[PDB]
């Protein structure tokens, strides 16, 4: 609240300093921001405690940055950490005390939890509460009455208005409890699903699963893990532990196929007990319990086929012990979020690897599913070797004179097609691909503009893939990339970042970017995180190049796009010039070729 | 350096400056490697010796040391060829110099220099001294232009501020001597005191200025005896740099926070720590003020916390490269005053004018294909006179 002569806020008169400040490695700002030291001997204990009570926002190598909020404190209480149980240790760890503001915030957030519980039974959602005064003073506004369908006091609530009531309670200061007591539940018989000994659970996966199952009752929340970290394995383990009917929701055909494959591989459950509620192919969804389907199908708004209508009615009628949702970052979308209310589930677990978006709808996930239970430390995984170390780099390509002339001259938005296609970046990508091809490194080129992708691919006679590409040709190209030594590069379009199971690649070049999309950036980066059989963290075997054009909007987009990666800790090294480019022969070495490319770009319209 | 300062002097001032008490020893210590040996050798000789002996008195290997030492001491004029006997006065003084004839102080020096730097920066609270203010203003690192308003800081001021304490103080004292000559204070008398430290009205004023700078402290209501501080004769870091352009500095003295804010955006200030961000805005603001990326990088490196010393390099390559690129972008467009030519009837005349401009140094850039060139306005008069002369 107090501002120094500079931008930073003043806290000299706010909180004191502990005498043993050197011993205490923890800081506590009044706003809730906490700065932990990664060099302290008690760093591991401090990391565990701060991860338990707060969500990371920036975890560089030296000083980690966390911030705590109501959702994080509710998650702490869910895993069973009381207000004293957290605040006493926070004061002990803190080297400068705990401000009264944070003290009162923690007290209020902890006490305002568990008073209101939401439990669904016999397809009816009852808002139970041991304390009656909570309901007595919660029925002040008329929205609750119009919502409600027309000790331990409970009342039934309308299915459709659950989301509205929950978001209302979040700001009403009475969060709802979504804990599932699968251990004590006789209404829905347990499913015959077990985890085979073959599956191996990594320490971070076990920690995330523990945070989810803080107690005997499963907690509904979101667990963010890298795509290569085995989030599918974590979800399968969660379903197996729940031992009740599980509905997994993918985002595409590839996602549902991969989910079924993961289920069969890691769970002893028989093949016949798993169904694919997919329009392309179905396996009698009503027949078995464990189901894998898609947001599009479940939330489909237009006319429903007869068989799909029967399946949807069966799904609505039945109650699901677990609702797994992969790629939760798309949930807050209208149709996708409608699925949450369409289907009934005790706990809706969420898994993803890039929980970031521009529109401020990510905060809605906290109530749509639950608080962010776990968020894996990418740097720690890199050190442990679970994830391949990546030498993140941004190659700056000077824009050609003429191309810059038209780009600046035109105030329209042909620049997206223009700066994405310039001779300098073309030569840079050609030289980089040549260098990695002679180094036997697998290349996955990326480009949002299909026009630019096709031009580059024809000029380099490479197998570009894109949306309306035939499925058979797509599979053939992927198989050739994985097996045929003569080919070691594939030019994938935006379809690549959506969902796929691609072979591990040693390099990932990105000539063009869709925009300031942290989601796309992280999604494409996750492709090369696949750990090799015997690599090492310090070898930096994996490389990521994000080619950008100097003095163009692409620079702003790249800077706005690398925010999530830098927050994780990756250091994007800038490369102004590439050694050997002048000696190496590359296309567009004369003014004329650039001229024809510019003419084609202009005629593109 | 002191070697430069002493080399930039005349023989008449040099021999006088070679005072008996200390100068012959202070200048001796300057002798890097070998000239010490030769000075000791021919300290006891009253007969000059041929130059060929000195030439051949060093082996073939490492002769460049011999030539450089001989040139340096010829510039110092310790001896004369006399045809290489040393100066009689220097010989006598050196023979007389060779068998012939605190914890609170360092803190005081630190505090005084810190308050001086606080005044140098726009600190509302600082020590007030009109003589110090005018001395800094005339030192070339500060300009007021309005006595009523406090003086501001010039471009050189920020560069001086970001320098390390040793070099900062040394340059400040160099400027002090240069301005002492201008104001009329005898240079030799004040200079000899500095040499004597490492072992009149003008003397009293000079000692007062040194005490204001914090190098000395009488401690006895300005008595004749003085106890020089450590800085008179001539530390761990505290900043931690992340990979996201974030600085965590364990700073309690406001001077360090001000120095960091000069080129970073401050976010939080804890009792024993402060958080800042190195953004384009702050870095380009510093560059426009006059700093260059080298000073910022050196400052962060010297004030580097022990935690980041283990990693090599200490400062992350991404941070260093980003700072350098930010400074470069500002000077992408290089401005240079000049005068253009047009309508060259014949290329022979243009080539002759180009040769003349190259000889005189007037030319700045030339274009043979377009038959044109650019000349600075200073050389514009010369080239115009040449054209008039035809």
């Amino acid at each position: 609240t107090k501002v120094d002569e500079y931008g930073a806020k003043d806290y000299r008169l706010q909180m004191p300093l502990k005498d043993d400040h050197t011993s205490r490695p923890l800081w506590v700002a009044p706003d809730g921001h906490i700065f932990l030291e990664a060099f302290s001997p008690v760093y591991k204990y401090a990391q565990d405690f701060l991860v338990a009570i707060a969500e990371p926002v920036c975890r560089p190598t030296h000083v980690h940055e966390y911030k705590l909020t109501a959702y994080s404190l509710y998650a702490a209480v869910s895993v069973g950490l009381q207000t004293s149980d957290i605040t006493e240790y926070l004061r002990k760890l803190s080297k400068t005390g705990v401000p009264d503001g944070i003290m009162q915030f923690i007290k209020l957030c902890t006490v305002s939890y568990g008073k209101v519980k939401l439990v669904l039974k016999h397809n009816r959602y009852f808002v139970e509460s041991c304390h009656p005064d909570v309901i007595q003073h919660l029925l002040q506004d008329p929205v609750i009455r119009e919502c409600r369908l027309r000790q331990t006091v409970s009342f039934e609530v309308k299915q459709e208005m659950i989301e509205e009531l929950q978001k209302r309670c979040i700001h009403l200061e009475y969060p709802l409890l979504a804990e599932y007591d699968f251990r004590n539940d006789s209404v829905n018989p347990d499913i015959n699903i077990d985890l085979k000994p073959t599956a191996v659970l990594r320490p971070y996966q076990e920690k995330s699963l523990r945070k989810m199952f803080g107690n005997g009752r499963a907690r509904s929340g979101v667990i963010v893990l890298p795509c290569g970290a085995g989030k599918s394995l974590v979800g399968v383990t969660a379903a197996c532990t729940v031992r009740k009917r599980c509905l997994v929701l993918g985002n595409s055909a590839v996602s549902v196929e991969q989910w079924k494959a993961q289920f069969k591989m890691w769970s002893t459950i028989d093949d016949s007990q798993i169904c694919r509620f997919t329009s392309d192919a179905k396996d009698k969804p009503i027949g078995c319990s464990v189901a894998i389907s898609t947001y599009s199908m479940l939330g489909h708004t237009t006319k429903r086929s007869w068989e799909a209508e029967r399946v949807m009615e069966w799904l609505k009628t039945q109650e699901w012990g677990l609702m797994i949702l992969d790629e939760v970052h798309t949930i807050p979308a209208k149709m996708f979020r409608r699925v949450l209310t369409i289907v009934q589930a005790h706990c809706k677990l969420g898994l993803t690897a890039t929980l970031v978006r521009e529109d401020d709808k990510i905060v809605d996930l906290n109530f749509l599913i639950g608080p962010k239970l776990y968020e894996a430390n990418w740097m720690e995984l890199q050190n442990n070797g679970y994830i391949a170390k990546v030498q993140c780099a941004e190659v700056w390509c000077p824009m050609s004179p003429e191309f810059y002339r038209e780009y600046v001259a035109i105030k329209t938005k042909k620049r997206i097609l223009l700066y994405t296609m310039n001779p300098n970046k073309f030569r840079a990508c050609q030289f980089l691909i040549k260098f990695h091809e002679r180094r036997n490194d697998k290349i996955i080129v990326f480009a949002d503009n299909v026009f630019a992708l096709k031009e580059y691919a024809i000029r380099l006679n490479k197998p570009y893939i894109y949306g309306p590409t035939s499925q058979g040709e797509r599979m053939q190209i992927l198989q050739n990339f994985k097996h045929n030594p003569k080919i070691n590069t594939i030019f994938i379009s935006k379809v690549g970042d959506t969902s796929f199971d691609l072979p591990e690649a040693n390099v990932l070049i990105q000539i063009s970017s869709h925009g300031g999309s942290r989601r796309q950036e992280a999604q494409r980066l996750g492709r090369v995180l696949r750990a090799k059989k015997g690599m090492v963290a310090e070898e930096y075997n994996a490389f990521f190049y994000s080619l950008v054009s100097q003095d163009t909007q692409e620079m702003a987009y790249s800077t706005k796009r690398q925010r999530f990666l830098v927050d994780q800790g990756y250091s994007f090294k800038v490369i102004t010039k590439l050694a050997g480019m002048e000696e190496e022969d590359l296309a567009f070495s004369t003014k004329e070729e650039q001229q024809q490319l510019l003419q084609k770009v202009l005629a593109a319209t | 350096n002191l070697q430069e300062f002493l080399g930039g002097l005349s023989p008449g001032v040099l021999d006088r400056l070679y005072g008996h008490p200390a100068t012959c020893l202070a200048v001796f210590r300057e002798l890097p490697s070998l000239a010490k040996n030769w000075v000791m050798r021919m300290l006891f000789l009253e007969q000059p010796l041929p130059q060929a002996a000195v030439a051949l008195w060093v082996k073939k290997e490492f002769s460049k040391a011999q030539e450089e030492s001989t040139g340096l001491l010829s510039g110092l004029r310790i001896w004369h060829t006399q045809l290489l006997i040393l100066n009689p006065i220097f010989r006598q003084n050196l023979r007389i110099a060779l068998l012939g004839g605190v914890p609170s102080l360092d803190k005081y020096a630190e505090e005084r220099w810190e308050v001086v730097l606080h005044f140098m920066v726009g600190s509302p609270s600082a020590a007030v001294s009109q003589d110090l203010a005018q001395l800094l203003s005339q030192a070339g690192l500060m300009k007021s232009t309005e006595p009523g308003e406090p003086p501001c800081i010039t471009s050189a001021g920020f560069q001086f501020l970001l320098l390390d304490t040793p070099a900062q103080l040394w340059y400040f004292m160099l400027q002090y001597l240069q301005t002492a000559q201008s104001r009329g204070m005898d240079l030799v008398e004040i200079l000899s005191f500095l040499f004597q430290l490492s072992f009149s009205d003008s003397l009293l004023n000079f000692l007062q200025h040194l005490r204001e700078f914090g190098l000395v402290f009488q401690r006895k209501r300005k008595s004749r005896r003085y106890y020089p501080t450590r800085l008179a004769i001539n530390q761990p870091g505290f900043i931690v740099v992340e990979t996201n352009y974030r600085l965590y500095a364990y700073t309690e003295s406001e001077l360090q926070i001000a120095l960091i804010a000069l080129f970073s955006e401050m976010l939080y200030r804890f009792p024993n720590m402060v958080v800042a961000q190195v953004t384009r805005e702050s870095v380009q603001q510093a560059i426009a003020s006059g700093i260059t990326a080298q000073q910022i990088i050196h400052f962060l490196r010297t004030r580097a916390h022990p935690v980041m010393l283990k990693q090599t390099p200490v400062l992350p390559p991404t941070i260093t490269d980003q700072i350098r690129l930010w400074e470069l972008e500002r000077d992408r467009l290089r401005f240079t005053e000049g005068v253009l030519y047009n309508q060259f009837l014949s290329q022979v005349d243009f080539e002759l004018l180009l040769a003349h401009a190259r000889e005189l140094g007037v030319l700045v850039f030339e274009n043979s294909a377009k038959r044109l060139m650019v000349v600075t306005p200073a050389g514009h008069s010369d080239v115009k006179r040449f054209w008039k002369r035809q």
């Binding site: 780099a393 075997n541 090294k573 800038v574 490369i575 102004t576 050694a579 | 260093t320 490269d321 470069l328």
Partner: peptide, 15 residues
């Protein structure tokens, strides 16, 4: 063998 490229091993900025 399998050594990192020069432009990633050392800064390519002119400084």
């Amino acid at each position: 063998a399998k050594e990192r490229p020069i432009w990633l091993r050392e800064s390519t900025v002119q400084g």
